[PDB]
C-alpha cells in the first residue's frame, strides 16, 4: 500500500519560514523520484521542482529558485521542502508526488499540506448548537464562529453519524472564519436519541462537544 503522508497545516508569518515533509512507505525510496506541486486558489497547479534520491540531484523551475529548497532523509524515507521568506501570495496547498522516469507520470500523491501566510492571531472557535424552531424529517445544525487558522474538524456523534451531513466550507470575514454544518435525521430519531456536535481546532488546543437540545 504505497503511501505519502505529509506534515500538518502550517501558519507562517510574513517573512517567516517553514519546512514541509512527506513520508514515503510501501516502495523502495531510491528507485523513484520525488516531485512537489503548488495549487493556488482557482489557478491551476504549478510544478515547483523535483529531486532524484539515488544521486541527490534537484531541478527547480526558475519561478521558484529562491523559495523552495529540497532535502531528502535517505534513511527516514521522507522528502522535505523548505519555503523561505513567505508573503501573502505563497498561501496555497502544496502537494508532493512520486514519479518514475519515462514510463510514468506522477502516480501517487500526498494528501496535501495547507499553508496560510498571515499575521493574524490564532483564536479558538465558539460553537453554538442550532436548535429546531413538523412531521416530515428534521434537520439539525452546528455553528462554528470566530476562529483562525483554517483546519477545524467537525463530526456528529463522534463519527457514528455520517449520512445526511453537509459540512460547509469556511468563509473569511475580517480575519476570522465561520463554519456551519447540518444533519437531517428522521423525526422518530430526534430528540429521542442524543445528537451532539464535535468541533476540534488543534491550533488552539480546543475540543468542544455540543449537544443539540430543543
Amino acid at each position: 500500500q504505497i503511501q505519502l503522508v505529509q506534515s500538518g497545516p502550517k501558519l507562517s508569518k510574513p517573512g517567516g519560514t517553514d519546512k514541509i515533509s512527506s513520508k514515503a512507505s510501501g516502495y523502495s525510496f531510491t528507485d523513484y523520484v520525488m516531485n512537489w506541486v503548488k495549487a493556488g486558489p482557482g489557478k491551476g497547479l504549478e510544478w515547483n521542482g523535483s529531486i532524484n534520491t539515488s544521486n541527490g540531484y534537484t531541478t527547480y523551475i526558475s519561478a521558484f529558485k529562491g523559495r523552495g529548497s529540497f532535502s531528502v532523509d535517505s534513511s527516514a524515507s521522507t522528502a522535505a521542502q523548505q519555503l523561505s521568506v513567505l508573503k501573502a501570495a505563497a498561501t496555497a496547498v502544496y502537494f508532493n508526488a512520486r514519479n518514475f522516469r519515462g514510463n510514468g507520470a506522477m502516480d501517487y500523491w500526498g494528501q496535501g499540506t495547507s499553508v496560510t501566510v498571515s499575521s493574524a492571531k490564532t483564536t479558538a472557535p465558539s460553537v453554538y448548537p442550532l436548535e429546531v424552531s413538523t412531521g416530515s424529517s428534521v434537520t439539525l445544525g452546528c455553528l462554528v464562529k470566530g476562529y483562525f487558522p483554517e483546519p477545524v474538524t467537525l463530526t456528529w456523534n463522534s463519527g457514528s453519524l455520517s449520512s445526511g451531513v453537509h459540512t460547509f466550507p469556511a468563509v473569511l470575514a475580517s480575519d476570522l472564519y465561520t463554519l456551519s454544518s447540518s444533519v437531517t435525521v428522521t423525526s422518530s430519531t430526534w430528540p429521542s436519541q442524543s445528537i451532539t456536535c464535535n468541533v476540534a481546532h488543534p491550533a488552539s488546543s480546543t475540543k468542544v462537544d455540543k449537544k443539540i437540545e430543543p
Binding site: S50, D107, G110, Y128, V132, T139, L143, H166, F168, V171
Partner: protein, 215 residues
C-alpha cells in the same frame, strides 16, 4: 516553457454521455511515446492519475476513461458519465525541463431538476448570553447550482451582515447546498419579532419562504 491551452474551461454533461476535454500544446511533447497525462482532482483531495503517456490507462481507473492524441493536440473522453466524475481535470507534460499544467476543466454533472429543502434556525441561548445573535438558513440538496436567497426583518429586505457558503457538487446525487447565516447583535435582534428567509429557484415561480417569530 511549454504552454498547455486546455478547452473548454467549464463543461456540463448529462449522465450517460461523452465529455470531450481537449489539450493543445505550444511546442511538441512527443519524444518517442508522447508525454502527456490526464489527472482528476476532487475538492480537498489529492489529484488522481487517470491516463499516462496520453493513451495508456492506469490500473484501477475505470475503462470509461479513454485518451487519444499525439504531438500537439490531445483529447480526453469519459465514455459514459457517472456522478463520481464531478471534479476538475488537468493535463500535465513531463517532457521539458519546466513541467507545466493546463488551466483545468471543471466538469458539472447535469441531473434532473431538484428543489431545495429549506430550514431556518434562530440564534442560540449560549449565543445571546455572550452577546450577538445570528440566523441560519440551510438550503440542502437542490439542482441546479444557480439560486438566490433574500432576507427580511419585519418585511424589511435587509442586506447588510450576510455570509454565504456553497458545497461542491455532491458526488452521489449531484446536488448542491448552501448555508446563509445572517449575523446581527443581541440588541438589534431583539428590536424585531419576525425574521424570514426567502429562497427562489428554477423549480418555482413562487419563492420558498421559511419564517419565524422571535417570541
Amino acid at each position: 516553457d511549454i504552454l498547455m491551452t486546455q478547452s473548454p474551461s467549464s463543461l456540463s454533461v448529462v449522465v450517460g454521455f461523452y465529455v470531450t476535454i481537449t489539450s493543445q500544446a505550444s511546442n511538441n511533447i512527443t519524444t518517442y511515446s508522447s508525454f502527456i497525462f490526464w489527472y482528476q482532482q476532487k475538492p480537498g483531495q489529492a489529484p488522481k492519475l487517470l491516463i499516462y503517456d496520453s493513451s495508456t490507462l492506469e490500473s484501477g481507473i475505470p475503462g470509461r476513461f479513454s485518451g487519444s492524441g499525439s504531438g500537439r493536440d490531445f483529447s480526453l473522453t469519459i465514455g459514459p458519465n457517472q456522478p463520481a466524475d464531478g471534479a476538475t481535470y488537468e493535463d500535465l507534460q513531463y517532457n521539458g525541463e519546466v513541467r507545466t499544467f493546463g488551466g483545468g476543466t471543471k466538469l458539472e454533472i447535469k441531473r434532473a431538476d431538484a428543489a431545495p429543502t429549506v430550514s431556518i434556525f434562530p440564534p442560540s441561548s449560549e449565543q445571546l448570553t455572550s452577546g450577538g445573535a445570528e440566523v441560519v438558513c440551510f438550503l440542502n440538496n437542490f439542482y441546479p447550482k444557480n439560486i438566490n436567497v433574500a432576507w427580511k426583518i419585519d418585511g424589511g429586505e435587509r442586506q447588510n451582515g450576510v455570509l454565504n457558503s456553497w458545497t461542491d457538487q455532491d458526488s452521489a446525487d449531484s446536488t448542491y447546498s448552501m448555508s446563509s447565516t445572517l449575523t446581527l447583535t443581541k440588541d438589534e435582534y431583539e428590536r424585531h419579532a419576525s425574521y424570514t428567509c426567502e429562497a427562489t429557484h428554477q423549480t418555482s415561480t413562487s419563492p420558498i419562504v421559511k419564517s419565524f417569530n422571535r417570541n
